[PDB]
Amino acid sequence: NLSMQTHAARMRTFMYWPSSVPVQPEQLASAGFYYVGRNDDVKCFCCDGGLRCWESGDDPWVEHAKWFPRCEFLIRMKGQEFVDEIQGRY
Ligand SMILES: CN[C@@H](C)C(=O)N[C@H](C(=O)N1C[C@H]2CCCN2C[C@H]1C(=O)N[C@@H]1CCOc2ccccc21)C1CCCCC1
């Protein structure tokens, strides 16, 4: 988990990511996620939030904010305003 603080390190976890999942490693790693090595389960290096069952059209930053809105990495990258909006606070 400490070794997942860099984008390149998270990317390397996707070596055996199934090609049929309709979400790409690059999008996932950019949003703080790394592959835990089973099915399509990923976790955030910062908040330890886990996501799975990726769907066509999913945006990992939106999903991050939907489910883990207090994540500090998410807040620092996208800002509190983005998070509030995803949470339906205007
Ligand atoms: C459809 N888009 C995906 C990203 C999505 O919304 N996934 C949800 C999810 O990952 N969630 C849902 C939220 C609800 C409360 C917090 N949950 C976090 C996350 C989830 O299910 N994570 C599991 C929890 C058990 O531990 C792990 C470990 C690794 C990966 C995922 C999870 C799914 C899960 C499976 C069926 C449909 C919703």
Ligand SMILES: [Zn+2]
């Ligand atoms: Zn997070």
